[PDB]
User: Fold this.
Amino acid sequence: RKQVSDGVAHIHASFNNTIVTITDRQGNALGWATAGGSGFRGSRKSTPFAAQVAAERCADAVKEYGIKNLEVMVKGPGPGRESTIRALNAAGFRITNITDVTPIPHXGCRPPKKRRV
Amino acid sequence: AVVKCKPTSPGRRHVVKVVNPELHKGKPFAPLLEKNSKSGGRNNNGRITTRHIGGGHKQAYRIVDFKRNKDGIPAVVERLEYDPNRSANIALVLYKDGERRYILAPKGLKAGDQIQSGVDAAIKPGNTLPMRNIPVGSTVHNVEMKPGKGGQLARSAGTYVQIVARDGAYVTLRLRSGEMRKVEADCRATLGEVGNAEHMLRVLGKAGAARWRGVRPTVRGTAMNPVDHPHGGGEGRNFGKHPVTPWGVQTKGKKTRSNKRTDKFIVRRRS
Amino acid sequence: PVIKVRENEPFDVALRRFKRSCEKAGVLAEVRRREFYEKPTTERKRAKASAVKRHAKKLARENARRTRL
Amino acid sequence: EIDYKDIATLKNYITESGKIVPSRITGTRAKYQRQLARAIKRARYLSLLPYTDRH
Amino acid sequence: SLSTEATAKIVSEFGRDANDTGSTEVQVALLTAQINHLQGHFAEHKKDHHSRRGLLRMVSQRRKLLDYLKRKDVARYTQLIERLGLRR
Amino acid sequence: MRHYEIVFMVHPDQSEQVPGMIERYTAAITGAEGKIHRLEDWGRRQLAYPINKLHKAHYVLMNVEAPQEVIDELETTFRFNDAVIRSMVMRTKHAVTEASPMV
RNA sequence: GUUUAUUAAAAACACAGCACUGUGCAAACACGAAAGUGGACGUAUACGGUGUGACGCCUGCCCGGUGCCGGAAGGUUAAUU
RNA sequence: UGAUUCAUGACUGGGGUGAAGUCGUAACAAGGUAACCGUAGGGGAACCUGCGGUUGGAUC
RNA sequence: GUCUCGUAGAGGGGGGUAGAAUUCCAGGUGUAGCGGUGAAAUGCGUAGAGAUCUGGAGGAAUACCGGUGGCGAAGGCGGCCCCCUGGACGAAGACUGACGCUCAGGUGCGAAAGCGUGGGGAGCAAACAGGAUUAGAUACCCUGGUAGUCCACGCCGUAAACGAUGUCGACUUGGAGGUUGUGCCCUUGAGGCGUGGCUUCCGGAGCUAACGCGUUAAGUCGACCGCCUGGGGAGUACGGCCGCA
Ligand SMILES: [Cu+]
Ligand SMILES: [K+]
Ligand SMILES: [K+]
Ligand SMILES: [K+]
Ligand SMILES: [K+]
Ligand SMILES: [K+]
Ligand SMILES: [K+]
Ligand SMILES: [K+]
Ligand SMILES: [K+]
Ligand SMILES: [K+]
Ligand SMILES: [K+]
Ligand SMILES: [K+]
Ligand SMILES: [K+]
Ligand SMILES: [K+]
Ligand SMILES: [K+]
Ligand SMILES: [K+]
Ligand SMILES: [K+]
Ligand SMILES: [K+]
Ligand SMILES: [K+]
Ligand SMILES: [K+]
Ligand SMILES: [K+]
Ligand SMILES: [K+]
Ligand SMILES: [K+]
Ligand SMILES: [K+]
Ligand SMILES: [K+]
Ligand SMILES: [K+]
Ligand SMILES: [K+]
Ligand SMILES: [K+]
Ligand SMILES: [K+]
Ligand SMILES: [K+]
Ligand SMILES: [K+]
Ligand SMILES: [K+]
Ligand SMILES: [K+]
Ligand SMILES: [K+]
Ligand SMILES: [Mg+2]
Ligand SMILES: [Mg+2]
Ligand SMILES: [Mg+2]
Ligand SMILES: [Mg+2]
Ligand SMILES: [Mg+2]
Ligand SMILES: [Mg+2]
Ligand SMILES: [Mg+2]
Ligand SMILES: [Mg+2]
Ligand SMILES: [Mg+2]
Ligand SMILES: [Mg+2]
Ligand SMILES: [Mg+2]
Ligand SMILES: [Mg+2]
Ligand SMILES: [Mg+2]
Ligand SMILES: [Mg+2]
Ligand SMILES: [Mg+2]
Ligand SMILES: [Mg+2]
Ligand SMILES: [Mg+2]
Ligand SMILES: [Mg+2]
Ligand SMILES: [Mg+2]
Ligand SMILES: [Mg+2]
Ligand SMILES: [Mg+2]
Ligand SMILES: [Mg+2]
Ligand SMILES: [Mg+2]
Ligand SMILES: [Mg+2]
Ligand SMILES: [Mg+2]
Ligand SMILES: [Mg+2]
Ligand SMILES: [Mg+2]
Ligand SMILES: [Mg+2]
Ligand SMILES: [Mg+2]
Ligand SMILES: [Mg+2]
Ligand SMILES: [Mg+2]
Ligand SMILES: [Mg+2]
Ligand SMILES: [Mg+2]
Ligand SMILES: [Mg+2]
Ligand SMILES: [Mg+2]
Ligand SMILES: [Mg+2]
Ligand SMILES: [Mg+2]
Ligand SMILES: [Mg+2]
Ligand SMILES: [Mg+2]
Ligand SMILES: [Mg+2]
Ligand SMILES: [Mg+2]
Ligand SMILES: [Mg+2]
Assistant:
């Protein structure tokens, strides 16, 4: 209920889904939306359009806080890397910063075995 | 060294000895000896209160300095010795002022080494300090639980404790059991590990070797009659019941700690 | 890739700059190659094949630059 | 000789994210590229240079 | 592993002069010094197979030089093995 | 008798103890017939990344020629000194006396 | 090695070895209205309980039932009020 | 009392040949999960799976 | 073959340390999904997951540099720092004086898996379980997951352990590169002229059944060793030796 006006949008763009979480600058979440939760399943859930719809829903969920400025942190290789940012800019927020925070081990743990399809 | 006996008799085929050619071969230091006669596991009502104890070799008690509070005066290790009373070896040490004491022997300690205790002692194996003055992450043994009470934790051969953290008046310790335990930082501890780590590799090899150590035979409850043990009975080998002690308490996982007074110091149980 | 949108900079320009910086950093290819474990023999085989292909293509280009169609 | 304390020189051979730039891009000789990599790793350890740009 | 000073001392002690670095006695003495010195290294590092290969090469080279010296001049060979404390 | 380059970083709250530590370490080196080729105090610098939640540290650089025993003792002192947050000892081919790029 | 003193000496009991499990020390546990005592002037490479029974090669599937261990959002529920 | 050699033995192990009956389709094309080597575990069967190795892999 | 000066190098053994990331634990914000696939389901989540921030524990591996790049007898070796230590190469000399080459038997080293004892265990993952697919699916796919992978010591002694090419030496047209030394010259630098070591690709003569090899030979010769003699049975049986198996 307290005004913030300075938030951070975290995009978790995986191959199967997009999770958009808007927090304040201290990392406390204010609202979230996901492509899977915005009425998309299966092959439709992992599209840029579903990610854009999720970004719009997250903006609507955080509308009460009166956020004006947004930093953006994108993590993952998923197809919803840029549609979410485009929707966030179209929703009226002022995109101040954009940063990639995809984790990269510096070697790290052994990955799962290759799939034989 | 760990030495396998040759099978010249069935009772020697499986024997494995721990042979240390550094222990003193002569007699112990007499002024630090006391007699200690045997109990057979019986209390002052004359009743057996711990089963399976009796006989075995006569043993003199060595007075061991677990407090390590003779501060500021260096001592030199004179010799290592066998102590029948414990798994660890002990070391006879001579202080500069001419006083002799027994200490638990840390791993690596040998005759001629120098040791010291107190707040200003060097961080070296065999030296004793309050844990307030020992670096976090260190390995220590013979750890006090109350300042000035004397060492009580990690005394058995090969054992040690890890100082994992230090917060305010307390340190957190990883014990050999796996428990994480808070202890006052004013409690003392000796640097290093208790020696004689090979102790657990010995193999007794025959029944008599347990009898030499004062251990009497265990009789299985399922080998008894019902009047004797909840497990007893049966025409043939029968069981059909949840395993219990001779007094009826479940004995395969049921927990028995109940100490609300000391619960506040257990950061994390061993499991 | 840290792209700070400067004043009076359009969002489309900022997005294109971010995309270019990500492509130059090559994070996507790194993630894709780290998704599953590659046996060391497989990695060596792939590196050798890429080097052989590059050299053979360069030689073929050199030969084809001196002929008429 | 490359000095791990020569931060100004070393910064020419790292990217914006802090990665070591390939010698095929910088035009550096191989023998000096190896010294550059060693110096950069030492500087990273001494915290004169960052491991990653997310610092 | 041998230092310059130790090498020069061995050369002076076993050669005709300080320039006699090539004599069989000098070579054998130098190899003996290196082998004895490495004994301590391999007492501590029992799994240093790669270095031990170089040590075994010194041993074989010394054996071949000694056999050559024995074939050529028996008296020099006897004096050298006595001085160096070698069984053969 | 080998040549070493020693860089150690002090917690900024203990910056006032830095001259004392420098004097003690140089005295320890010179006691065992050691030489100090170079000694620089870089003061407080901003760290490229946080260390123990800090963001600045007091840097000291030395170039000495000392026996291995005293070098090992110095490393032990660094390890057990709570003020020194990070140190680094390197061998150098020769003595270094010229001014570093920091100064 | 032990055993039914007095019809059973054995394939029974024990046994070194193995495993599960309890136990952070005023230990668990046991004798005891209690004070205390044994465990132990021991301290997890230690001590108790249980099963198996040198050694060699081994020890597969089932947690639905009974027990033990963990959980605590909900339902039900004692004295009390 | 041993050694060696020949014959023989309920039963049992795999092998070859013939013939094609039952069960699948492992390999040859990228053989439809690239194949193969050593090893280990599993499976009516060809085989499958893990770990390292090879190219005597198609496409790129 | 020895000595002197120097050079490059993931060569080996021991110890320490750094940052990224995964998992787990605790707490803050927050709310209905997460995860997975070709599509699903099993699984996880209102007992508050997933997401995000903070702190802690722990193991394993070292992004970028990085390269038909380097080192090593082969097997193999990759963050940084120290300690111990093996080999190679180059320039001028000085020294010894055939001290050499090869090697049955012997001995040593020898990936991964596996074995023994004691530790450790994050991630991965034989076996195993469930969900799918299918006619079936003891698989391929999914969700989990134990040995094992890690450490110390010992054993095992095998791999398409391959260049499917034994070691040593001499000789025989060329081109373009990589890497690492060193000499001389100039207008002094991505400079020019040489001379060594190792290495990649192409190709001449010659060789070869052909494919191809081609001064790093599969060309022309010498020294010594190992090995083959139609396919299957079979690298199997029996016997010996070795091994805990
Ligand atoms: Cu109730
Ligand atoms: K004892
Ligand atoms: K028994
Ligand atoms: K019974
Ligand atoms: K019975
Ligand atoms: K009976
Ligand atoms: K320190
Ligand atoms: K009898
Ligand atoms: K009996
Ligand atoms: K037990
Ligand atoms: K046996
Ligand atoms: K046996
Ligand atoms: K059950
Ligand atoms: K059950
Ligand atoms: K209740
Ligand atoms: K016969
Ligand atoms: K017969
Ligand atoms: K197949
Ligand atoms: K194939
Ligand atoms: K296989
Ligand atoms: K079947
Ligand atoms: K070296
Ligand atoms: K390391
Ligand atoms: K020979
Ligand atoms: K193990
Ligand atoms: K593990
Ligand atoms: K898995
Ligand atoms: K080792
Ligand atoms: K084997
Ligand atoms: K190959
Ligand atoms: K060259
Ligand atoms: K040159
Ligand atoms: K063997
Ligand atoms: K075994
Ligand atoms: Mg997956
Ligand atoms: Mg298919
Ligand atoms: Mg009485
Ligand atoms: Mg008992
Ligand atoms: Mg006793
Ligand atoms: Mg027993
Ligand atoms: Mg009976
Ligand atoms: Mg009863
Ligand atoms: Mg019966
Ligand atoms: Mg029954
Ligand atoms: Mg009962
Ligand atoms: Mg030499
Ligand atoms: Mg009797
Ligand atoms: Mg009778
Ligand atoms: Mg009788
Ligand atoms: Mg008591
Ligand atoms: Mg009591
Ligand atoms: Mg008592
Ligand atoms: Mg039995
Ligand atoms: Mg259940
Ligand atoms: Mg319960
Ligand atoms: Mg086949
Ligand atoms: Mg097929
Ligand atoms: Mg198929
Ligand atoms: Mg196939
Ligand atoms: Mg075979
Ligand atoms: Mg299987
Ligand atoms: Mg753990
Ligand atoms: Mg060297
Ligand atoms: Mg041979
Ligand atoms: Mg292995
Ligand atoms: Mg097994
Ligand atoms: Mg093992
Ligand atoms: Mg595990
Ligand atoms: Mg799986
Ligand atoms: Mg073979
Ligand atoms: Mg290989
Ligand atoms: Mg072959
Ligand atoms: Mg080479
Ligand atoms: Mg060619
Ligand atoms: Mg031919
Ligand atoms: Mg065979």
The radius of gyration of chain B is 22 Å.
